[PDB]
Amino acid sequence: KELQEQLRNCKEQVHTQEAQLSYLKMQVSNRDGEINRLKTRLVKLVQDYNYMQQNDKIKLLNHQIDYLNKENTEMDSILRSKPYIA
Amino acid sequence: IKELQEQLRNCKEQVHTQEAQLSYLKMQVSNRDGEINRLKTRLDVGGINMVKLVQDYNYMQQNDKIKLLNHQIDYLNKENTEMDSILRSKPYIA
Amino acid sequence: NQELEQQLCIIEKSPLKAENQKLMRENNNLQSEIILSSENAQQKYNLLTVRL
Amino acid sequence: NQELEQQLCIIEKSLNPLKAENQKLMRENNNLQSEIILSSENAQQKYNLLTVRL
Structure with a gap:
């Protein structure tokens, strides 16, 4: 009868535990990446x-x-003389 | 209600497998500390x-x-290109 | 002496100072993120406390 | 060559060790502040249980 509540607490505990594992898989996996950063420095x-x-x-x-270019030196001399059309 | 016990028996298994992994991860947390300072010491x-x-x-x-x-x-290529584009034939002939 | 200048220029025109300067920024961000998750969580749960 | 060495001597004896210590400690902080975010995740772990009832 009360077995419904028994089951419930265990499952809630299971899911809480799964969450805790996931939390740590993450905290730990993040520590890897945090350390991998250092593997990548030292x-x-x-x-x-x-x-x-x-x-x-x-x-x-x-x-x-x-070539692509210094011709701009030479280009300013032309920038000076081609406007002599004016 | 019988069947609830069966599922509880199943739920209790993991539970056990998580207990094992939780221990592992806590230990691994220590190993990460066990990798990192360690790297800090090496820097020291x-x-x-x-x-x-x-x-x-x-x-x-x-x-x-x-x-x-x-x-x-x-930048240089296009400034020179356009200046030449104009300037070389600006008067065309004159 | 010339071979040395050839390699010395590697720093003159672009290391440890570079990582240092980045860290001086990177940790302002990590600091901001710990704030923005720690204090922000506190506000998120000031709201959950009331909401729950 | 001595001067080329002196530039390096200055760098290595007085600058790099400061940068080395500063980056070391800032790496401790970077590591620690990547952690610590993980402690804010612990705050989140608490939060995550409050959200069960939400």
């Missing part, structure tokens, strides 16, 4: 193969700075 | 890891530099 070859290739793309880019 | 001693931080830092910073200069390229 292959040299790639660091050299980009940095050095990032470095080279920049140097190429510096030459692109001159 | 040294390492940091200063070298890794510099190199990874540099990787992303160079990537930001390529973006900054790419901005500079679109």
Whole structure:
């Protein structure tokens, strides 16, 4: 008869426990991520193969700075003379 | 009402499996503390890891530099392109 | 000496200071979040207390 | 080379250790404040039971 209440308390306890597990799965999983952050603070070859290739793309880019462009120096002289149509 | 006991018998199982996992997680909480200070202690001693931080830092910073200069390229390229676009034929012939 | 300057420029033009400066911001946020969940929860449950 | 070393000496003896300590402690705080949010989650865990009856 009262078995309905027995069952009820256990189930409520079960769900409370599930929630507690989930709460901790989360607190714990978050601690992983919190620590993974530190694992990420505390292959040299790639660091050299980009940095050095990032470095080279920049140097190429510096030459692109001159073609794409440094012509702006030369362009201001034309900016000065083509308006001589006026 | 009989069947309630059967379900209670079933409910009581987990309960038991959760008791086991709850213990595990509490222990794991201690292990996380057991991983983290630990890392703090290691920092208290040294390492940091200063070298890794510099190199990874540099990787992303160079990537930001390529973006900054790419901005500079679109700027210079288009200013010069448009100035040439006008200016070279502005008088056309004159 | 030249090889050293080549690597020294890695910092001059862009590490530890960078993480430090970020932390000086990142923890204002974490601090804000602990507030905005702790005090905010208190208000949420001042409401639940009344509501319940 | 000595000066290149001196720039590093200055950095390593007087700046990096401050940054190292400051980031260390701020990492303790970052870790701790990621935790602590987890304690606000504990406040939430209480809340989550109040919400049962809601």
